[PDB]
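Predict the structure of Beta-lactamase 2.
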Amino acid sequence: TVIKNISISQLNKNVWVHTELVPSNGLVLNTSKGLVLVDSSWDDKLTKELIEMVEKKFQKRVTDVIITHAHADRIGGIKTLKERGIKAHSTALTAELAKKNGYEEPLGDLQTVTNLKFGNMKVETFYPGKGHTEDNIVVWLPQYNILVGGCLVKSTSAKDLGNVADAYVNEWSTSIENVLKRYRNINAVVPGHGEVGDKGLLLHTLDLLK
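Done. Here is the predicted structure for Beta-lactamase 2.
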């Protein structure tokens, strides 16, 4: 099932990919205690629309969002989250960076490895080291072996590294290796931008870094 406006695409019973317009991705987790987003959207305008679409469709509130990095493209809806009482989880580094850059601050509650449970839905967040940004994290759904790569992970259609101004192009390969070492059996990988793939996208990203 794929539902448009913003587009949402069902991966399984409780997991959806959200995509907003170039295009960027995150997840919607339909849990027994509310909806959880892995990343919100580009700005407040799209973040409000995302929230409104999912709350109406799933008939539950968005309770939590996990922010995968501090750059404008992922932090940009933070005002909307905070004023609605939506918990914005992040690492301390992501929160520091957000503040530095003039954004409202997410919680800074995520450690190198954090294990969250939302109703029945298990989520692990992992900081694998620097890459696309200094602070980039990945998000793992161990019940589904689904990895949200964020901007650490490039889609097949990405044929170059894109913008490397805030990137750490040496450490990025080690970071990707750390994800491959931690998650040896992956069913799907959601890149930051582009089509859903598998562990092949991690290998693709390694190649782009050579």
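The helical segments are 44-58, 72-75, 78-83, 92-100, 171-182, 200-208.
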